[PDB]
């Protein structure tokens, strides 16, 4: 009921909506990844909505993102600053990334007030680093 | 000119933009509904921009949404948590819904400061319950 | 590291993402404009991220936007409040505009705290006035194609353009509606499908004419019957004062005079010259149209 708890749920509900808008433009493999990221954002909304009285995500899940980041970070050959939206499909995943950075700043205020959702904010920080790699893999698969 | 009045108009102008982006993916019947919702959001922006010196929406309009919610709430058979964005069209209306909850939280700060726009914030609360039903009717019409 | 600096970079990074989503729906010209606006938002993020220790944009850039705003502001003829998202393409640029107003309010807090990024916030204020003009130019470009398709007489291409949200009441410089050109050229199904969407039946051009006027003087009976079934003024007057009955008696088509007469045509009327339609029928010497018009009077 506090102001920081209601803003934090409002943005995590706005994040999981763009991911549902953006998973219809990707292929079949990344669509299985983006469906398992929406389930995890629905768990985080319970941990934060109840002020911790419900279990949030386990640490087995933050170890699941880091398996993926190390798998795509090899495919992506890093380069200089490249403007977002190379293709239409990779432009949808660059909108989802910048929402996950705004959700990270809201969940990170709940942590510095109520001491809860520290392992949730570590999930949104690894998430927004994954959505940056999924956006640059699509551009290369088109190249 | 105050900080709460300018934020409240900034989000209601951002809400009525997504509804214009999302009314090209729906059919002809719901398009007549979504065009009459944009006219009503343009009235609310005058009530809040002038700090009440202009008439906002009447109560005849909040009685118009509630006719619709009771009409669709019969078509939609409620179920367990279903992830947003079943189809592409119903994914556009789930982005518009989560903007209307963010506009509700801004208009509701104007109310708890300047005592204005109480019957406006009651329009954005009924609106975001309608956009949730319009999103679940489209999925069923596809099913 | 301060709270106002991190929020300001978070929104400028969210702004330059929507512009990348919205530059795939525009044409090749505006795509060259929207690519040079993304480079400039990437400069502003360096000025604000480093708290000024890096050079931001020059003033040569705020003078570049203002060249564009003065070029499109002539093409766009301003009108009353029109709802965002006329077409699908112009709906994408109205989402980008409302993000640029939210970025302006964040950059403008950094200015009122740290005294930096004053010429950046003047770039985002000129930007959001440019994205409003680029959004209203696209609808117009869509609306001129409806006039061209109405003059071409295309059955399916008019419905294709109408299903994408082009305006039914888009006017030219001479003030003509697509209903005017459709009734003039003689394509009945185009008048039907334009009236089904809600085109204004009694629009006036710069000469004061009406779709019933051109439909009467063009000799197409079906468009007269359809327009009179849908609520056209039977006694509309042009700049001189000719009724549909006046031009109908002038052109020598008897059956359209019968069709005008069935729905209540004024025979007792006059023009600015002073002539009744019976007088213009007598002046030409057609005996039959002088006999039918006088007997019903």
């Amino acid at each position: 009921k506090d102001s920081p708890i209601i803003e934090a749920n409002g943005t995590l509900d706005e994040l999981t909506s763009f991911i549902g808008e953006a998973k219809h433009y990707v292929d079949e493999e990344m669509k299985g990844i983006l469906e398992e990221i929406q389930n995890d954002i629905y768990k985080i909304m319970g941990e934060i909505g109840s002020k911790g009285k419900i279990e949030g995500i386990s640490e087995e899940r933050i170890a699941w993102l880091l398996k993926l980041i190390l798998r795509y970070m090899e495919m992506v050959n890093l380069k200089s600053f490249v403007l977002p939206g190379g293709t239409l499909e990779s432009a949808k995943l660059d909108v989802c990334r910048t929402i996950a950075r705004r959700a990270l700043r809201k969940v990170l205020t709940v942590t510095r007030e109520f001491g809860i959702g520290a392992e949730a904010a570590a999930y949104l920080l690894a998430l927004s680093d994954l959505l940056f790699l999924l956006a640059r893999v699509i551009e290369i698969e088109q190249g | 000119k105050d900080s709460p009045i300018i934020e409240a108009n900034g989000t209601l102008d951002e809400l009525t933009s997504f509804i214009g982006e999302a009314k090209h993916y729906v059919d002809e019947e719901m398009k007549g509904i979504l065009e009459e919702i944009q006219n009503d959001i343009y009235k609310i922006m005058g009530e809040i921009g002038s700090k009440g010196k202009i008439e906002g929406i009447s109560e005849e309009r909040i009685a118009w949404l509630l006719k619709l919610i009771l009409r669709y709430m019969e078509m939609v058979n409620l179920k367990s948590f279903v992830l947003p964005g079943g189809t592409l069209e119903s994914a556009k209306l789930d982005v518009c819904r989560t903007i209307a909850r963010r506009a509700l939280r801004k208009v509701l700060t104007v109310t708890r400061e300047f005592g204005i726009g109480a019957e406006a914030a009651a329009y954005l609360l009924a609106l975001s319950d309608l956009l949730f039903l319009l999103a679940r009717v489209i999925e069923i019409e596809q099913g | 590291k301060d709270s106002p600096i991190i929020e300001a970079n978070g929104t400028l990074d969210e702004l330059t993402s929507f512009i990348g989503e919205a530059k795939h729906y525009v044409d090749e010209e505006m795509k060259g404009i929207l690519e040079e606006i993304q480079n400039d938002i990437y400069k502003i993020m360096g000025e604000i991220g480093s708290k000024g220790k890096i050079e931001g944009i020059s003033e040569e850039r705020i003078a570049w936007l203002l060249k564009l705003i003065l070029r499109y502001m002539e093409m766009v003829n301003l009108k009353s409040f029109v709802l965002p998202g006329g077409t699908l393409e112009s709906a994408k640029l109205d989402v980008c505009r409302t993000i640029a107003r939210r970025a302006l309010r964040k950059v403008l807090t950094v200015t009122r705290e740290f005294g930096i990024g004053a010429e950046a916030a003047a770039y985002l204020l000129a930007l959001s006035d440019l994205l409003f003009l680029l959004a209203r130019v696209i609808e117009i470009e869509q609306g001129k194609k409806l006039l061209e398709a109405a003059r071409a007489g295309q059955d399916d291409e008019v419905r294709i353009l109408m299903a994408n949200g082009a305006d039914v009441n888009a006017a030219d410089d001479v003030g003509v509606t697509p209903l005017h050109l459709a009734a003039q050229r003689g394509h009945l199904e185009i008048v039907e499908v334009l009236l089904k969407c809600g085109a204004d039946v009694n629009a006036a051009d710069l000469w004061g004419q009406t779709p019933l006027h051109l439909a009467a003087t063009a000799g197409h009976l079906e468009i007269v019957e359809v327009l009179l079934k849908n609520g056209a003024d039977v006694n509309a007057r042009d700049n001189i004062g000719h009724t549909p009955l006046h031009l109908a008696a002038w052109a020598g088509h008897l059956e359209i005079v019968e069709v005008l007469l069935k729905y209540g045509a004024d025979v007792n009327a006059q023009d600015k010259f002073g002539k009744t339609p019976f007088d213009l029928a007598i002046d030409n010497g057609n005996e039959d149209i002088a006999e039918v018009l006088q007997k019903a009077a």
Partner: protein
């Protein structure tokens, strides 16, 4: 035959005038379209050099008689269309009563799909505070008859008529017109029996136009030949 067929639909029109009256030079450009079958036309003219030194109504007759409605029984008398697309030269002497005179020379011809009227006008001996240079003419126009006769020796035609311009104080300014038309091309043209054109003009303004301008609607019908 090949001439009249160019006018069976709606035809785009361009008008261009270069003028000099009492040493005051000006230019007018006009654009619109014509429906010769019905003899109805619409044009909008703009003064491209600022404010006109003469009243718009004095230029109406100078600023395309090929758009006249010639009814079927008079088709053999339509000189104007028969000269197309090569066109004709139209020369006029316009004498304003108790005032100056206009001399005009125009070429009326197709340039591509567009009917073009390109005019040179010279005015002399006008009075400084007369009805013309003093801008005392009402912004309206009366109906007139244009009397045409064949000029066989010149394989062309002549016309005479008198224009009546309403003056703001209720008086009438007469403008006597003499006209001659000769084909531009070397091909044969129709040379008509005596007849006349009945003309009506409606002048208006464009509410969105900031430049000095004239909006014009005109209907033209040929008569003066008994029907059978």
């Amino acid at each position: 035959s090949k001439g009249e067929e160019l006018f069976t639909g709606v035809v785009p029109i361009l008008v261009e005038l270069d003028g000099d009256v009492n040493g005051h030079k000006f230019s007018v450009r006009g654009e619109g379209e014509g429906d010769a079958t019905n003899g109805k036309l619409t044009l909008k003219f703009i003064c491209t050099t600022g404010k006109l030194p003469v009243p718009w109504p004095t230029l109406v007759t100078t600023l395309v008689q090929c758009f006249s409605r010639y009814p079927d029984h008079m088709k053999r008398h339509d000189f104007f269309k028969s000269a197309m697309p090569e066109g004709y030269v139209q020369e006029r002497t316009i004498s304003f009563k108790d005032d100056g005179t206009y001399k005009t020379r125009a070429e009326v011809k197709f340039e591509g799909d567009t009917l073009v009227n390109r005019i040179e006008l010279k005015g002399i001996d006008f009075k400084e505070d007369g009805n013309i240079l003093g801008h005392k003419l009402e912004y309206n126009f009366n109906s007139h008859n244009v009397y045409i006769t064949a000029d066989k020796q010149k394989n062309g035609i002549k016309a005479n008529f008198k224009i009546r311009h309403n003056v703001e104080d209720g008086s009438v300014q007469l403008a006597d017109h003499y006209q001659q038309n000769t084909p531009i091309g070397d091909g044969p043209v129709l040379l008509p029996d005596n007849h006349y054109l009945s003309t009506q003009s409606a002048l208006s303004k464009d509410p969105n136009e900031k430049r000095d301008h004239m909006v014009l609607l005109e209907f033209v019908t040929a008569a003066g030949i008994t029907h059978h």
